[PDB]
Amino acid sequence: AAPL
Amino acid sequence: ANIVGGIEYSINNASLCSVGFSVTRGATKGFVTAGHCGTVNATARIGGAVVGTFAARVFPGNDRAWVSLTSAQTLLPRVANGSSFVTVRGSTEAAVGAAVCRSGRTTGYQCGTITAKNVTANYAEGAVRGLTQGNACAGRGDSGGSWITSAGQAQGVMSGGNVQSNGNNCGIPASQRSSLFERLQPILSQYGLSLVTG
Structure with a gap:
Protein backbone atom coordinates (compact mmCIF):
# COMPACT_ATOMS: atom_id res chain seq x y z
CA ALA A 1 0.00 0.00 0.00
CA ALA A 2 1.64 3.37 -0.78
CA PRO A 3 0.64 7.05 -0.12
CA LEU A 4 -1.35 8.64 -3.03
CA ALA B 1 -10.82 29.88 -5.76
CA ASN B 2 -13.91 28.03 -4.61
CA ILE B 3 -12.83 25.28 -2.22
CA VAL B 4 -14.72 22.10 -2.98
CA GLY B 5 -13.79 18.56 -1.72
CA GLY B 6 -12.05 16.47 -4.38
CA ILE B 7 -10.38 19.17 -6.45
CA GLU B 8 -6.73 19.38 -7.36
CA TYR B 9 -4.22 21.61 -5.63
CA SER B 10 -0.38 21.71 -5.95
CA ILE B 11 2.23 21.83 -3.15
CA ASN B 12 5.31 24.07 -3.75
CA ASN B 13 4.80 23.85 -7.47
CA ALA B 14 5.68 20.11 -7.53
CA SER B 15 3.30 17.54 -5.94
CA LEU B 16 -0.42 17.30 -6.55
CA CYS B 17 -3.05 16.28 -4.04
CA SER B 18 -6.83 16.64 -3.64
CA VAL B 19 -8.79 18.91 -1.23
CA GLY B 20 -10.49 16.99 1.57
CA PHE B 21 -13.08 19.30 3.24
CA SER B 22 -13.71 23.01 3.84
CA VAL B 23 -13.26 23.84 7.53
CA THR B 24 -13.00 26.91 9.74
CA ARG B 25 -10.87 27.57 12.80
CA GLY B 26 -12.49 30.63 14.27
CA ALA B 27 -12.23 33.35 11.61
CA THR B 28 -9.58 31.34 9.66
CA LYS B 29 -10.58 29.48 6.51
CA GLY B 30 -8.87 26.22 5.65
CA PHE B 31 -9.27 22.76 4.27
CA VAL B 32 -8.26 19.37 5.66
CA THR B 33 -6.08 17.07 3.49
CA ALA B 34 -3.44 14.24 3.91
CA GLY B 35 -0.30 14.89 6.02
CA HIS B 36 2.00 13.33 3.46
CA CYS B 37 0.94 15.96 0.87
CA GLY B 38 3.07 18.82 2.25
CA THR B 39 5.14 20.05 5.12
CA VAL B 40 4.30 22.93 7.38
CA ASN B 41 4.48 26.24 5.48
CA ALA B 42 4.43 24.61 2.09
CA THR B 43 2.54 26.76 -0.42
CA ALA B 44 -0.72 25.38 -1.88
CA ARG B 45 -1.91 26.63 -5.29
CA ILE B 46 -5.21 26.03 -6.97
CA GLY B 47 -5.20 26.58 -10.69
CA GLY B 48 -1.84 28.33 -10.55
CA ALA B 49 -2.89 30.81 -7.78
CA VAL B 50 -1.63 30.77 -4.16
CA VAL B 51 -4.53 29.92 -1.87
CA GLY B 52 -2.73 29.32 1.47
CA THR B 53 -0.06 27.28 3.25
CA PHE B 54 0.13 24.06 5.32
CA ALA B 55 -0.52 25.06 8.99
CA ALA B 56 0.06 21.71 10.58
CA ARG B 57 0.44 18.03 9.70
CA VAL B 58 1.25 14.66 11.24
CA PHE B 59 2.79 12.05 8.94
CA PRO B 60 3.74 9.22 9.38
CA GLY B 61 2.07 7.74 12.54
CA ASN B 62 -1.11 9.43 11.35
CA ASP B 63 -1.69 11.04 7.96
CA ARG B 64 -3.48 14.41 8.39
CA ALA B 65 -2.96 18.11 7.67
CA TRP B 66 -4.93 21.38 7.30
CA VAL B 67 -4.11 24.27 5.00
CA SER B 68 -4.81 27.79 6.19
CA LEU B 69 -6.31 29.77 3.40
CA THR B 70 -6.39 33.43 2.61
CA SER B 71 -9.62 35.30 3.24
CA ALA B 72 -10.19 35.59 -0.49
CA GLN B 73 -11.01 31.88 -0.81
CA THR B 74 -14.66 30.71 -0.87
CA LEU B 75 -15.28 27.68 1.31
CA LEU B 76 -18.18 25.56 0.27
Whole structure:
Protein backbone atom coordinates (compact mmCIF):
# COMPACT_ATOMS: atom_id res chain seq x y z
CA ALA A 1 0.00 0.00 0.00
CA ALA A 2 1.64 3.37 -0.78
CA PRO A 3 0.64 7.05 -0.12
CA LEU A 4 -1.35 8.64 -3.03
CA ALA B 1 -10.82 29.88 -5.76
CA ASN B 2 -13.91 28.03 -4.61
CA ILE B 3 -12.83 25.28 -2.22
CA VAL B 4 -14.72 22.10 -2.98
CA GLY B 5 -13.79 18.56 -1.72
CA GLY B 6 -12.05 16.47 -4.38
CA ILE B 7 -10.38 19.17 -6.45
CA GLU B 8 -6.73 19.38 -7.36
CA TYR B 9 -4.22 21.61 -5.63
CA SER B 10 -0.38 21.71 -5.95
CA ILE B 11 2.23 21.83 -3.15
CA ASN B 12 5.31 24.07 -3.75
CA ASN B 13 4.80 23.85 -7.47
CA ALA B 14 5.68 20.11 -7.53
CA SER B 15 3.30 17.54 -5.94
CA LEU B 16 -0.42 17.30 -6.55
CA CYS B 17 -3.05 16.28 -4.04
CA SER B 18 -6.83 16.64 -3.64
CA VAL B 19 -8.79 18.91 -1.23
CA GLY B 20 -10.49 16.99 1.57
CA PHE B 21 -13.08 19.30 3.24
CA SER B 22 -13.71 23.01 3.84
CA VAL B 23 -13.26 23.84 7.53
CA THR B 24 -13.00 26.91 9.74
CA ARG B 25 -10.87 27.57 12.80
CA GLY B 26 -12.49 30.63 14.27
CA ALA B 27 -12.23 33.35 11.61
CA THR B 28 -9.58 31.34 9.66
CA LYS B 29 -10.58 29.48 6.51
CA GLY B 30 -8.87 26.22 5.65
CA PHE B 31 -9.27 22.76 4.27
CA VAL B 32 -8.26 19.37 5.66
CA THR B 33 -6.08 17.07 3.49
CA ALA B 34 -3.44 14.24 3.91
CA GLY B 35 -0.30 14.89 6.02
CA HIS B 36 2.00 13.33 3.46
CA CYS B 37 0.94 15.96 0.87
CA GLY B 38 3.07 18.82 2.25
CA THR B 39 5.14 20.05 5.12
CA VAL B 40 4.30 22.93 7.38
CA ASN B 41 4.48 26.24 5.48
CA ALA B 42 4.43 24.61 2.09
CA THR B 43 2.54 26.76 -0.42
CA ALA B 44 -0.72 25.38 -1.88
CA ARG B 45 -1.91 26.63 -5.29
CA ILE B 46 -5.21 26.03 -6.97
CA GLY B 47 -5.20 26.58 -10.69
CA GLY B 48 -1.84 28.33 -10.55
CA ALA B 49 -2.89 30.81 -7.78
CA VAL B 50 -1.63 30.77 -4.16
CA VAL B 51 -4.53 29.92 -1.87
CA GLY B 52 -2.73 29.32 1.47
CA THR B 53 -0.06 27.28 3.25
CA PHE B 54 0.13 24.06 5.32
CA ALA B 55 -0.52 25.06 8.99
CA ALA B 56 0.06 21.71 10.58
CA ARG B 57 0.44 18.03 9.70
CA VAL B 58 1.25 14.66 11.24
CA PHE B 59 2.79 12.05 8.94
CA PRO B 60 3.74 9.22 9.38
CA GLY B 61 2.07 7.74 12.54
CA ASN B 62 -1.11 9.43 11.35
CA ASP B 63 -1.69 11.04 7.96
CA ARG B 64 -3.48 14.41 8.39
CA ALA B 65 -2.96 18.11 7.67
CA TRP B 66 -4.93 21.38 7.30
CA VAL B 67 -4.11 24.27 5.00
CA SER B 68 -4.81 27.79 6.19
CA LEU B 69 -6.31 29.77 3.40
CA THR B 70 -6.39 33.43 2.61
CA SER B 71 -9.62 35.30 3.24
CA ALA B 72 -10.19 35.59 -0.49
CA GLN B 73 -11.01 31.88 -0.81
CA THR B 74 -14.66 30.71 -0.87
CA LEU B 75 -15.28 27.68 1.31
CA LEU B 76 -18.18 25.56 0.27
CA PRO B 77 -19.98 22.64 1.94
CA ARG B 78 -19.53 20.43 -1.20
CA VAL B 79 -17.55 17.47 -2.63
CA ALA B 80 -17.16 17.18 -6.43
CA ASN B 81 -18.89 14.34 -8.18
CA GLY B 82 -18.28 14.91 -11.92
CA SER B 83 -20.07 18.18 -12.81
CA SER B 84 -22.35 17.66 -9.77
CA PHE B 85 -21.86 18.05 -6.04
CA VAL B 86 -22.52 16.10 -2.79
CA THR B 87 -23.49 18.39 0.15
CA VAL B 88 -21.55 17.98 3.36
CA ARG B 89 -24.14 17.50 6.12
CA GLY B 90 -21.99 16.41 9.09
CA SER B 91 -19.33 13.87 10.13
CA THR B 92 -21.14 10.84 11.58
CA GLU B 93 -18.75 7.97 11.27
CA ALA B 94 -20.18 5.15 9.25
CA ALA B 95 -19.66 1.57 10.31
CA VAL B 96 -18.12 -1.43 8.45
CA GLY B 97 -20.40 -2.61 5.68
CA ALA B 98 -21.55 0.95 4.97
CA ALA B 99 -21.42 2.30 1.44
CA VAL B 100 -18.95 5.16 0.92
CA CYS B 101 -17.64 7.26 -1.98
CA ARG B 102 -14.40 9.26 -2.35
CA SER B 103 -13.51 12.14 -4.62
CA GLY B 104 -10.07 13.18 -5.94
CA ARG B 105 -8.39 14.67 -8.98
CA THR B 106 -7.10 11.40 -10.58
CA THR B 107 -9.96 8.86 -10.57
CA GLY B 108 -12.79 11.32 -9.85
CA TYR B 109 -15.66 10.02 -7.77
CA GLN B 110 -15.55 6.29 -6.81
CA CYS B 111 -17.83 4.38 -4.41
CA GLY B 112 -17.51 1.05 -2.58
CA THR B 113 -17.98 -0.08 1.04
CA ILE B 114 -16.01 0.15 4.26
CA THR B 115 -14.39 -3.16 4.93
CA ALA B 116 -12.20 -2.66 8.04
CA LYS B 117 -11.10 -0.12 10.58
CA ASN B 118 -7.91 0.47 12.50
CA VAL B 119 -5.64 -0.78 9.75
CA THR B 120 -1.88 -0.05 9.79
CA ALA B 121 -0.30 0.88 6.47
CA ASN B 122 3.46 0.40 6.41
CA TYR B 123 4.61 3.14 4.12
CA ALA B 124 8.32 3.55 3.21
CA GLU B 125 8.40 6.45 5.66
CA GLY B 126 6.95 4.67 8.68
CA ALA B 127 3.68 3.09 9.67
CA VAL B 128 0.40 5.00 9.76
CA ARG B 129 -1.96 3.46 12.18
CA GLY B 130 -5.71 3.58 12.65
CA LEU B 131 -6.76 3.88 9.02
CA THR B 132 -10.16 2.77 7.74
CA GLN B 133 -10.22 0.59 4.62
CA GLY B 134 -12.77 0.77 1.81
CA ASN B 135 -12.75 -0.91 -1.57
CA ALA B 136 -13.72 2.13 -3.64
CA CYS B 137 -10.69 2.50 -6.03
CA ALA B 138 -8.24 5.39 -6.07
CA GLY B 139 -5.05 6.45 -7.92
CA ARG B 140 -1.88 8.56 -7.40
CA GLY B 141 -3.05 12.18 -6.93
CA ASP B 142 -6.23 11.31 -5.01
CA SER B 143 -4.45 11.65 -1.63
CA GLY B 144 -6.09 14.12 0.71
CA GLY B 145 -9.44 13.81 -1.06
CA SER B 146 -12.82 13.40 0.53
CA TRP B 147 -14.44 10.12 1.65
CA ILE B 148 -18.19 10.83 2.14
CA THR B 149 -21.45 8.90 2.23
CA SER B 150 -24.20 9.82 -0.28
CA ALA B 151 -26.11 11.15 2.69
CA GLY B 152 -23.37 13.77 3.10
CA GLN B 153 -21.57 12.47 6.18
CA ALA B 154 -17.87 13.17 5.86
CA GLN B 155 -15.71 10.17 6.80
CA GLY B 156 -12.07 11.17 6.27
CA VAL B 157 -9.30 11.93 3.79
CA MET B 158 -7.57 9.58 1.31
CA SER B 159 -4.27 8.31 2.65
CA GLY B 160 -3.01 5.42 0.47
CA GLY B 161 -3.76 2.17 -1.31
CA ASN B 162 -2.50 -0.99 -3.09
CA VAL B 163 -1.88 0.74 -6.34
CA GLN B 164 -0.93 -1.30 -9.43
CA SER B 165 1.64 -0.22 -12.08
CA ASN B 166 -1.01 1.82 -13.87
CA GLY B 167 -1.09 4.19 -10.83
CA ASN B 168 -4.47 3.10 -9.40
CA ASN B 169 -6.29 0.01 -8.12
CA CYS B 170 -9.33 0.52 -10.37
CA GLY B 171 -8.39 -2.40 -12.72
CA ILE B 172 -8.32 -5.15 -9.98
CA PRO B 173 -11.65 -6.36 -8.51
CA ALA B 174 -13.19 -4.64 -5.45
CA SER B 175 -12.52 -7.72 -3.37
CA GLN B 176 -8.79 -7.16 -3.81
CA ARG B 177 -8.65 -3.41 -3.17
CA SER B 178 -7.30 -1.73 -0.06
CA SER B 179 -7.86 1.97 -0.21
CA LEU B 180 -7.20 3.59 3.16
CA PHE B 181 -8.37 6.88 4.62
CA GLU B 182 -7.59 8.83 7.76
CA ARG B 183 -10.69 9.35 9.96
CA LEU B 184 -11.95 12.97 9.97
CA GLN B 185 -13.07 13.24 13.64
CA PRO B 186 -9.62 13.13 15.29
CA ILE B 187 -8.34 15.77 12.77
CA LEU B 188 -11.23 18.13 13.67
CA SER B 189 -10.61 17.86 17.41
CA GLN B 190 -6.81 17.81 17.17
CA TYR B 191 -6.81 21.16 15.35
CA GLY B 192 -10.04 22.73 16.80
CA LEU B 193 -11.65 22.89 13.32
CA SER B 194 -15.31 22.95 12.42
CA LEU B 195 -16.69 21.43 9.25
CA VAL B 196 -18.42 23.84 6.87
CA THR B 197 -21.88 22.18 6.15
CA GLY B 198 -24.86 23.03 3.96
